Design a protein around this nucleic acid. Sequence first.
DNA 1: TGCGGACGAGAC
DNA 2: CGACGCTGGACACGAGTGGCTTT
DNA 3: TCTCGTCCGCGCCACTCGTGTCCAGCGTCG
Lengths: 235, 255, 253, 596
Amino acid sequence: MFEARLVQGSILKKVLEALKDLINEACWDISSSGVNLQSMDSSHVSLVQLTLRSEGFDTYRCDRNLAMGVNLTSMSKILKCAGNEDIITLRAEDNADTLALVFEAPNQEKVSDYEMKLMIPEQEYSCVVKMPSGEFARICRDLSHIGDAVVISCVKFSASGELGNGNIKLSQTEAVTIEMNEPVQLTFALRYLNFFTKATPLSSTVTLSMSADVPLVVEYKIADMGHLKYYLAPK
Amino acid sequence: MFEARLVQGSILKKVLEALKDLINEACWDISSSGVNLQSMDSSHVSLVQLTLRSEGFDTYRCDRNLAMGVNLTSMSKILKCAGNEDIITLRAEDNADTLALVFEAPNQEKVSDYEMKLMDLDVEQLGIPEQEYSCVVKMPSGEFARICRDLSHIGDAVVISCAKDGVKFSASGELGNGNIKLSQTSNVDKEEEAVTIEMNEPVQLTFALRYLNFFTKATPLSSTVTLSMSADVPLVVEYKIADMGHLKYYLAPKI
Amino acid sequence: MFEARLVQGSILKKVLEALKDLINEACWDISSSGVNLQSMDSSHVSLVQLTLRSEGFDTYRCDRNLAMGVNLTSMSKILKCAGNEDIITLRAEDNADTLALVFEAPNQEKVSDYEMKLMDLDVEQLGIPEQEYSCVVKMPSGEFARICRDLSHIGDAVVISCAKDGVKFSASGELGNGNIKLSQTSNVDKEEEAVTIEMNEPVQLTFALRYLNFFTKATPLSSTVTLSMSADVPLVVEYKIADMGHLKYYLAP
Amino acid sequence: GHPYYLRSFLVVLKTVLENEDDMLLFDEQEKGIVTKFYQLSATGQKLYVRLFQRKLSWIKMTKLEYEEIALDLTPVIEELTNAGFLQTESELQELSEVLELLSAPELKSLAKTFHLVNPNGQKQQLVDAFLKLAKQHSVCTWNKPGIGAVILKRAKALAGQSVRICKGPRAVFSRILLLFSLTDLSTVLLVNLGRMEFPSYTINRKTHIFQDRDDLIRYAAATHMLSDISSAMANGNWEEAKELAQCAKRDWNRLKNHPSLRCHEDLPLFLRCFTVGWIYTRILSRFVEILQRLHMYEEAVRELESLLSQRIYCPDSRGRWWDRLALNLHQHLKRLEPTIKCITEGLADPEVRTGHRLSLYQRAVRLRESPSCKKFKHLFQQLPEMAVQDVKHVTITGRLCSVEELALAHYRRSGFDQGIHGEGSTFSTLYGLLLWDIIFMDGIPDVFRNACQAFPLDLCTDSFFTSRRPALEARLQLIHDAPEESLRAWVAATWHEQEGRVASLVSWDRFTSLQQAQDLVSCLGGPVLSGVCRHLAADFRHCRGGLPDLVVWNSQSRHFKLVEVKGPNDRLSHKQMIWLAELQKLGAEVEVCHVV
DNA sequence: TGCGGACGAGAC
DNA sequence: CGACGCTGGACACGAGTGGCTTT
DNA sequence: TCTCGTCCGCGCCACTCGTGTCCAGCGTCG
Ligand SMILES: [Ca+2]
């Protein structure tokens, strides 16, 4: 038996919209701590780590931990059948082959149920930039529109392409701040970087963490109670 | 040779947004009481009955009844020409197969005239003899449309069951299973959000879901939609129109 | 050694994306003083020109002109990042190697920079002198965009039929014929929605509709548009840019 | 003149119509159809033959382009329709055919019109869904017009004009082609048949392969179903092949009691190979192949055992089945004593010869030395010993030319200038050149039926050395002791008298010139040519293949080395081993060139 | 049936 | 005005049919 | 690892069409 009632169903909708194409199949590990997802991306250079505690859920009961392997396409399509304010309930018995999503609007005149078929060392980063997700999303999108690879420098994004080159210099003072502990100049791909930007509504600002030969980390923080981190292998 | 003028012309455009997907072409019966469509879908599973009474149409005069079959997609393309506020009037010649639609601007400064080929085809008759339906449900059109879309996200069939507790849609597919439950609320204010249901017989019956999606294209016509069914009768989905007409979709059982 | 600055960087973006398809691999022949370009369409049937006053911009670098060999698709790709409210500076690197476009936000905390290698440029320099046009009508550009769109939906050739009282767009196609009559606004406001008419003699001539769509794609740049119609000569469609520039299209039937 | 396809069709038709015994089985209506075909314009015949070679299905008039016949072929289509050979789209009253006629975009548009479940999908699934929708949904829906009729009308209107060859005349002409192909449209015969000049002989017919129209129709159905099975094997749909073969076996079992078959068993073997029972036995052999492919080894064994008791149908292949019953009894299934019994019966069987006799024998020793069969001390009981003497092996290193070309270059460096590589065609061609007068001799009945027969029917059958035994023995003894000048004269006379005449044996492109043939004949000598010609005359079917590839020789030294080249991933088949041993016995010098 | 690729088992 | 969701056009494949020698 | 036995796939070329995949224009709702 297991229940998880979340009033802000739009949060779940957008977090599973972010992982729509990053991973094909993944499992929703659940314990007394909460819902954790450590997923190996379809591409072999990236990793996904979503963490949510058990405090924000209105109800939570995990007698036995369940992997909850769900095809993200199917469950994302099911979640698309819920409104922004639709309260979303995740349910799965310890011996249940199907996962239930109960959508109940706050006005309570409507209730629906769906059933779907169930089937990195820690290291402090030398530099980290906390800047709005919109800014980095626009930079990555435009620099992928100009080229295929972008190098980040201590901030500067420089994209190299067959047609030409681009170089953008940022400033610090929705704010942008850098620890400027070390200088870096490291290249990265754009397709996975572009995929890592569908989580713009998922959080306000992203903290891009980089250092000397440490994998790139993007972080989108839920307003509370959880967060999400995408790891990308540097080129 | 008949003339039909209408002020809130977008209403007519909304009608063309609903029939276009369902019926490629239809017979446009003309009468003094009102203009009827009385056509059915190509695949012989669903019927669409459109009635626009002459009372709503200001300056309505028709010499004789006309068939004037119309290519629905072509008429929708012509009606896309106007805006959401232009007044629209249609003129039909005594015998020439050229329907002329002219739209005037809300401020009466932009006038647009167009003509159509107005192809002639057969005019069949579908009785749909009045059967007393049960478990009549009156609900907002938007909720019904989004419920239909959500269920079409899963499978290719739907089942509808009405009981004293409320109405229940359901759809099971290979990907998964789902269902929608709606309960009567009986709003005091009745801001077109009431889901009040009259109960006479606890029936349950099955339909296809693509045709429900094609029926949902009539949602902009009015906020309220009436769904009625019984043990064996076809499902009836009625949208009122500006207190002057109606658009009804009848769907046969899935089995 | 060429420098141009514009606080309202949006207008250049709209100007460039307007021409992103009607001319490809076009030419840039901006003189030493004054900005101007002209190019024949890819179908060799119509012509597009634009003139922006040098003093209209903020600053200028005292030097000679260069080919400024520019390609729109590349430019658009580069300029797509530029915002619709930021300051835009165009800088020219010597030896005709690259052109740099620097976009800075008014907040001056998310500044940027850009540049791109250019391409071999051939000068066509049609330079057709202007001739007097008989019928002229000034009307909102959104109205023209809507008219062009629905006529393209319903027809293939657009008829002007310039007249003193008003205008009458006419066309036909396999789904019948369509006519739209616009009357004189005659309102005290004389806003951009208002249409003005100046006639000497009516002129009737049919024009292609696909390139009409390609040219009306420049609708968001200007609030209004002036159409000049005369017999046996290409139609003139003209857009105003803050009274600081003129974007013209010659449409030969 | 007529094009090549029309030329071949008229030659086939004329040859079949000349066959008085083969003309009688055709019904008066079928003869009327054939004589209606001759009452056509040249463009009409050209278009009909062009459509005949295509598939049997509806074809759009848009996809009918033929610049050689006419720019506008509509009058020709109308003439054919009036004649009765082509049925236009007015007769397209079947939904399953009109749906298949429509292209994929058109079918997708039709599915979108009818609100199908998957408008964007495969064509086959679209046709299946359309059939399913046509089966119901319109019987009671608020007149009672079938929705299938509406779908058919819409599809017919969408597809436009479309023609298809009629069933009747197509079947009649297919049976005419089959009657022609009894004595041997195939592509090799579709083109050049009008220009190929067949050899000369006297047509002599005494017996009827088929007795009546029903027998010929049954044989045509059997061979058409065999062709369907063969196409299933070629395309890899082995389950469809298994189902078709099961249906064929049930048909054969139903037909085994037909008294007409009691006449077919009295036909000579070379003529008995053109009966319904022979085709059904061949179908059963293909069924055995299917079972072996799909791993019902026990059922394949049972089928082979049933076949091996039918000494009347396909006795020449009795070796192929005995060998596979041994392999399907020892390797795939681990029976050992029944395998030994099968080996003994196969070796004692007179119809097992050359490679398929060696293979069994090899299996025999593989069971006479293996420890698993030590208790079975009978395989040594009689086991008629056959031994093939080993031949010399020479290794070659090298690596863009073919392997055989590399070996030819090697032997060119070793003092053997002249060298050719045609495998069997070098010895088969030489045998044909030497014995053209006896292979195509007169006096043998029921072996020359048509005029377009490239070889007597006795070939690929032991009876070739039974009917013509005196002349063959006289010639093979005369060649044995004959001077090189006489052999040169014989080969030159045969080449000059019959130049360009097609034959199943002689390949005129094997020798670049007559001088090369003369030199090869002189170098091979008398005994070698006599031996190879005798081994090809006796049981030609089992001695046709497995011959050495290259014949390399030097003119001055008169030294030759029949070389069998095996690539790095090749092996000596049993037929090749038998042929190499036989050539070793004849005094010819033979060795195996292994190229790495 | 006749060719060429490949893999699988007994003996190293 | 813009980012998201939806949808049709363009595109490298592999499969199937057809023509192969009026020269 | 080496050797022998056994199985699997083969008309030929070009022309068009089915097919799953990918990219750019379009209506919209906060
Ligand atoms: Ca060989």
